[PDB]
């Protein structure tokens, strides 16, 4: 039934003043201050959290290696697997449709 | 069973604000919280986020709309008026 105190001069229950009670090897209960939780990175278009990427605080993405921050595929660490598939599909169909419109319209003008 | 006879969604107001004023609100609250039909994915999943903003939970599509119904009647007659004026410009 031991009671704890803040270990810093901020007395108020603000967002960056979170504490949790642990038991130290001294047999006593201290409130140890905890950092804010990290939000996952999101896809550019869909906005869903994209898997394979570590969830860290923004400054902590500088001391982490490259394999934790991106996936192999094109637009890897930024876009979804299916969104990358979507623009792969979309790009092909209408770069092939343009060269269909290109040959179709030149036929109409050539007839006249 | 049938918990209320006529107050419906406006039971939350209890005995306040007058009977007629409670049933103006009931009509618009019924529409603004109703689920509407997705014109892109074909599902009954369109919900109001905020006045004029109707997001379909499936297919994640947002359409601009009226305050309390997805498509106001005055807007729909506009969409047909533009159409008939359009189909004659390139007639």
């Amino acid at each position: 039934a031991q009671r704890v105190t803040f270990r810093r001069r901020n007395p108020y229950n603000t967002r960056s003043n979170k504490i949790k009670v642990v038991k130290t090897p001294g047999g006593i209960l201290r409130a140890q201050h905890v950092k804010k939780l990290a939000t996952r990175p999101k896809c550019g278009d869909c906005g869903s959290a994209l898997q394979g990427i570590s969830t860290l605080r923004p400054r902590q993405y500088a001391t982490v290696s490259k394999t934790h921050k991106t996936v192999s595929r094109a637009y890897g660490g930024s876009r979804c697997a299916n969104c990358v598939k979507e623009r792969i599909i979309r790009a092909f169909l209408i770069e092939e449709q343009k060269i269909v419109k290109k040959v179709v319209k030149e036929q109409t003008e050539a007839a006249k | 069973a049938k918990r209320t006879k006529k107050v419906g969604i406006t039971g939350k107001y209890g005995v306040r604000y007058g009977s007629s004023l409670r049933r103006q609100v009931k009509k618009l609250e019924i529409q603004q919280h109703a689920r509407y039909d997705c014109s892109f994915c074909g599902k009954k999943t369109v919900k109001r986020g905020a006045a004029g903003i109707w997001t379909c939970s499936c297919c994640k599509k947002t359409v601009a709309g009226g305050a309390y119904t997805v498509s106001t009647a005055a807007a729909a007659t506009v969409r047909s008026t533009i159409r008939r004026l359009r189909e004659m410009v390139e007639a």
Partner: protein
Amino acid sequence: GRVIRNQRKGAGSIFTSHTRLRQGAAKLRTLDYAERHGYIRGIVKQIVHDSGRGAPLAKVVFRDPYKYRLREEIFIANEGVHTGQFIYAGKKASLNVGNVLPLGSVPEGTIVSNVEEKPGDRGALARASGNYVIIIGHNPDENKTRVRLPSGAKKVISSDARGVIGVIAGGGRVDKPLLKAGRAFHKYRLKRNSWPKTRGVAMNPVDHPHGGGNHQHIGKASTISRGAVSGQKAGLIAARRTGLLRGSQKT
């Protein structure tokens, strides 16, 4: 006496606008060169709520015609506009809702919103929810267009003024009674501090023209002249008639 509440609003000390969460300046696209002779296609990214107004706003994205850049626009969403749409902005752009077209290049009877009244203002009349403009008649030579305003006014503006075809989203926002004092509290928590309103007749004579007296009353006519000065203009400004509206507009 003392200066009165409508006099104290011009100091703009506490009577300013609340603008922390307001999205931006919802203007039209600029009339640089690519609309006056052709068009340019744009995409709608997201339609979002705006604190302070009841009409949603759209984020319309265009490609920069002079740099490898993706300049984004803040338009007032037309009812019907959806995320993922394609938006065409030019002179030869089609007559479809969501497109930005000049008044002189649209047929008579067209429904247009977010309409400049001087070409290049990037936005003007018919901005509020459920409001639109209609073209009445063009004057080709000395180019002009005759249109009707949401107030019911007929206004002639330059034929090259622009406007998004259709009607602003969010129509009928006012058909719902707030039913509650505190509902008006949140309507004006994000608009401005013009709520609540003590009556001027429930006041002291030092504080208002209408204050004082053994009974709560005006005392003199509440219909006030144009030539009245700041301090005397409290009541029904410049009223031509008053009473109850019997008859039509008679405009």
